Design a protein around this ligand. Structure first.
Ligand SMILES: Cc1cn([C@H]2C[C@H](O)[C@@H](COP(=O)(O)OP(=O)(O)OP(=O)(O)O)O2)c(=O)[nH]c1=O
Ligand SMILES: [Ca+2]
Ligand SMILES: [Ca+2]
Ligand SMILES: [Ca+2]
Ligand SMILES: [Ca+2]
Ligand SMILES: [Ca+2]
Length: 901
DNA sequence: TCGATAAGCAGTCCGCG
DNA sequence: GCGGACTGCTTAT
């Protein structure tokens, strides 16, 4: 097999590399790598190395990496550019793996672990590590085993061995319900003392050294705790055995308001799953506790136990260990669904970076571009310092707030990367500038044509047309990957809808789910078989289809994020290729493209309708337009349609056969006007929206920019079994909105769009009547909590204290003198509830850690004093008033002359 | 929260005769 | 009461 790296590090003048050799074995080597860097040289000096601008360079080969680094410093002292890849391990990988890396995941040791630490005096600080580690569960992907290290004797209590038999039993049998599918994969090791546990853990680690190390909060808690605890008991040298090269570093992570420490383990790639989830999931969650996320992702119930976690080991060691094991498994289950480890491996090996560098789009692109240029013997420029400067972004149209009955939307494919490719925007393709007119002059095609030679953006930039820049070349490769995965995602989605339709008529039989590839549209044969399947088999196929869609989503949306990240990186001062001329060339072109096509679409539809100056485009944001289709429907007449699907088909046909060719013509003209390299503005129909045929539903409404709701029948070619609400920006979509209120507001919107005013009024009256029965957590607002200390003046709110911070201060006074009470953590999220006048907490609100029940000794008081009236007005009535006033609708029935009867 | 801009709403402070 | 200036937070793209 072809060899591939596992990890790479620079330690002084050595590269330490772990890799898989040609026989599939894991090996380690130390290489005295001699790096090369570059200086510009005279034209008269023959060379094969040229910088990205075609200027000749001489290669300087250094005796060692320290010499190269020192040379860079002296070049800065002299005032001359030191060219080349200054991150020597990236150059090492580029030299050692000079081919497309083919990796085998089955050879990569992926470790998932979780520790338990009993602490009687609050949160066990990892930097102090003053309490015994009393459980470790460590799952190894190569062995496919859960290794459980269980401390039986502690200063906080001596316990009996954990029982695998009780663990397996149902909770209704007094068991822990450790899933049957992992029971046979548990290797249980009890220990008489903590020293023996840790020494054995280190020996085990030495034998089965993680390449990828993950878990939940492992980077911020488990790893620093283990390192520091071992350091405290045994000394530094023993603690450093967590690194295969025996090198570690305390790394200070700084943010806007403070800093924290993590432990860098040289020769390991830590991908904390909480951070993978935050980067790759495109959710914003009210809580990031593993129980919360597990419930959300997997629909598994919260791990239930009695009493505080600090007393769980002594009271119920059996459950304590079982829950530690289950916690490790839950992360594996989330990964089986979301496939973020797979994604990280894919991207990391593609870029030829340390796998953990996938968190950095700048590092990822630096390596991709470096490797690409190196293939041509080209030499990358030195990174430079730049002052942070604001720059303009997208255009967003101001909508007229209203109901909008029939709506068809259109959206440009991968806009910013398509602009880069079309215009040919790259550091080395800049050709010069032209004299800019106001943007509206380009939008209306009245400005002078920018160039007859070069490809242009309306920000004034011109670009070469003779050859693709490296940025366009490399962005295209990843775009093509993204496109393939999006195809699989949408097929799985369409396949899901076929199964949903079939589920209306399940067969009374005993059968099996069909063995099918959900990434491809179901054949006629598969469709016929599906229509004969039981509900049991259909539901299993639906689950599998949806899992396939999720896998496709992960792969596509994050490749989209990477390519959009390249466009963004051009506006980040830390990027080697930072250039506001290029960043603004993209964003300004986008503003033109949107408003240009708004004009073209209005012109086309006014022509087909025989009108003049009417606005068919009601809204647009960045690269999308929303077109009022009322007049199109009315031209045939609603009476002519058999059912909802009939007019959806009609609009689908109209969009594809009439509107898209008109849009294409408009963009081809724009390409000519800007003299671009290649026409790549591809705007396709996205949504078809409207009320159900014959209903009083309003179809859709806008309240303002980035705030709208549509009743969608078809999305990008997926024809839904049931209409789907596309709600953007409204409170139903905000993690800050109480859970039960999101739900209520969504139903109000559903009724508005699908059923009409009277239905909305019926629901509102009921919610208002019953909402005080809702669980307090379900009606609590959510907020991130920053700068608690800034606004804390002797335990009371300082000037300008935010509402949620005031709530935290209230909580802090209420729990004062309790080392056991859950502390609000700076930077994390809180639930917030308003309090009625004259409450014993002495303020108008209280807040506590999100994803948790408020502590028992104040819970009863919070419940008694919760201000339901304020809660309803602020979170429910105010947003609903916004929706209905925009839609020109009343949520309460207005008095009429009929009331006389 | 270590790892592009536009723009919405909640809330504080305080003016607005 | 509402709005503008400002902070804080959370979206859409
Ligand atoms: C979502 C997103 C978009 N954008 C910019 C770049 C996008 O090209 C542009 C439009 O966003 P989208 O329409 O969401 O995405 P897209 O056009 O890139 O891809 P597609 O429609 O094919 O799924 O907005 C960002 O800069 N960062 C982001 O995170
Ligand atoms: Ca735990
Ligand atoms: Ca788009
Ligand atoms: Ca599309
Ligand atoms: Ca059937
Ligand atoms: Ca879009």
């Amino acid at each position: 097999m072809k060899e591939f790296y596992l990890t790479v590090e620079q330690i002084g003048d050595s590269i330490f590399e772990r890799y898989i050799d040609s026989n599939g074995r894991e090996r380690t080597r130390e290489v005295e790598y001699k790096p090369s860097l570059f200086a510009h040289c005279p034209e008269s000096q023959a060379t094969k190395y040229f910088d990205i601008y075609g200027k000749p360079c001489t290669r300087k080969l250094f005796a060692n990496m320290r010499d190269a680094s020192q040379w860079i410093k002296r070049m800065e002292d002299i005032g001359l550019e030191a060219l080349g890849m200054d991150d020597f391990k990236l150059a090492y990988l580029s030299d050692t793996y000079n081919y497309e890396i083919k990796y085998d995941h089955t050879k990569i040791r992926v470790a998932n672990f979780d520790i338990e630490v009993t602490s009687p005096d609050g949160f066990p600080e990892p930097s102090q590590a003053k309490h015994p580690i009393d459980a470790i569960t460590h799952y190894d992907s190569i062995d496919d085993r859960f290794y459980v290290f269980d401390l039986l004797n502690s200063p906080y209590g001596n316990v009996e061995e954990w029982s695998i038999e009780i663990a397996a039993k149902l909770q209704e049998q007094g068991g822990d319900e450790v899933p049957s599918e992992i029971i046979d994969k548990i290797i249980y090791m009890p220990f008489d003392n903590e020293k023996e546990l840790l020494m054995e853990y280190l020996n085990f680690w030495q034998q089965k050294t993680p390449v990828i190390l993950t878990g939940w909060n492992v980077e911020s808690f488990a790893i620093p705790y283990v390192y520091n605890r071992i350091k405290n008991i045994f000394g530094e040298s023993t603690a450093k055995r967590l690194s295969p090269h025996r090198k570690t570093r305390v790394k200070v992570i700084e943010n806007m308001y403070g800093s924290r420490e993590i432990i860098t383990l040289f020769g390991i790639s830590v991908l904390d799953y909480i951070d993978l989830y935050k980067k790759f999931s495109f959710t914003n969650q009210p809580s990031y506790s593993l129980d919360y996320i597990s419930e959300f992702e997997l629909n598994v119930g919260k791990l239930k136990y009695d009493g505080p976690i600090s007393k769980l080991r002594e009271s119920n060691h059996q459950r304590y260990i079982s829950y530690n094991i289950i916690a490790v498994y839950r992360v594996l289950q989330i990964d089986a669904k979301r496939q973020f480890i797979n994604l990280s491996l894919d991207m990391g090996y593609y870029a030829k970076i340390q796998i953990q560098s996938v968190f950095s789009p700048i590092k990822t692109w630096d390596a991709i571009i470096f490797n690409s240029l190196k293939e041509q013997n080209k030499v990358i420029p030195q990174g430079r310092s730049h002052p942070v400067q604001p720059y303009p972004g997208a255009f967003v149209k101001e909508p007229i707030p209203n109901r909008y009955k029939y709506v068809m939307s259109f959206d440009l494919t991968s806009l910013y990367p398509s602009i880069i490719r079309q215009v040919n925007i790259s550091p080395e393709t800049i050709a010069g500038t032209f004299k800019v007119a106001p943007l509206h002059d380009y939008i209306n095609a009245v400005a002078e044509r920018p160039s007859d030679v070069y490809s242009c953006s309306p920000n004034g930039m011109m670009y070469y047309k003779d050859r693709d820049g490296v940025v366009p070349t490399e962005i295209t490769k990843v775009f093509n990957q993204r496109k393939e995965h999006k195809g699989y995602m949408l097929a799985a989605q369409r396949n899901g809808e076929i199964i949903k339709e079939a589920l209306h008529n399940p067969n009374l039989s005993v059968d099996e789910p069909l063995d099918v590839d959900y990434r491809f549209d179901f054949s006629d044969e598969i469709k016929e078989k599906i229509k004969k399947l039981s509900a049991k088999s259909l539901n299993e196929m639906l689950f599998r289809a949806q899992r396939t869609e999720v896998a496709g989503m992960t792969a596509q949306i994050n490749r989209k994020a990477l390519i959009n990240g390249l466009a963004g990186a051009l506006g980040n001062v830390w990027f080697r290729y930072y250039d506001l001329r290029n960043a603004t060339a993209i964003t300004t072109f986008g503003q033109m493209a949107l408003q240009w096509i708004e004009r073209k679409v209005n012109e086309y539809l006014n022509e087909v309708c025989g009108t003049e100056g009417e606005a068919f485009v009601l809204y647009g944001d960045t690269d999308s337009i929303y077109v009022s289709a009322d007049k199109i429907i009315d031209k045939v007449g609603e009476s002519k349609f058999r059912d909802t699907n009939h007019w959806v088909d009609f609009l689908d046909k109209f969009a594809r056969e009439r509107m898209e060719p008109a849009i294409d013509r408009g963009f081809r003209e724009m390409c000519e006007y800007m003299n671009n390299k290649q026409h790549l503005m591809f705007m396709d129909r996205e949504a078809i929206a409207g009320p159900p045929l014959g209903s009083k539903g309003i179809g859709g409404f806008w309240t303002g920019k980035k705030r709208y709701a549509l009743n969608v029948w078809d999305m990008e070619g997926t024809r839904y079994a049931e209409p789907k609400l596309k709600i953007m920006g409204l409170e139903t979509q905000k993690s800050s909105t109480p859970k039960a209120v999101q739900k209520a507001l969504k139903e109000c919107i559903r009724r508005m769009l699908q059923e009409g005013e009277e239905s909305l009024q019926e629901y509102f009256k009921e919610f208002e009547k019953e909402f005080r029965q809702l669980n307090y957590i379900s009606i609590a607002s959510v907020s991130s909590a920053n700068n608690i200390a800034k606004y804390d003046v002797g335990g009371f709110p300082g000037p300008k204290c935010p509402f949620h911070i005031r709530g935290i201060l209230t909580y802090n006074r209420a729990i004062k003198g309790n080392i056991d009470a859950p502390q609000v953590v700076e930077g994390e999220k809180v639930y917030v509830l308003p309090l009625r006048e004259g409450n014993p907490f002495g303020d108008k609100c209280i807040a506590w850690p999100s994803g948790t029940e408020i502590t028992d000794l104040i819970k009863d008081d919070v419940l008694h004093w919760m201000d339901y009236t304020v809660l309803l007005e602020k979170t429910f009535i105010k947003p609903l008033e916004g929706f209905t006033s925009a839609a020109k609708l009343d949520y309460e029935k207005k008095a009429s002359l009929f009331d006389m009867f």
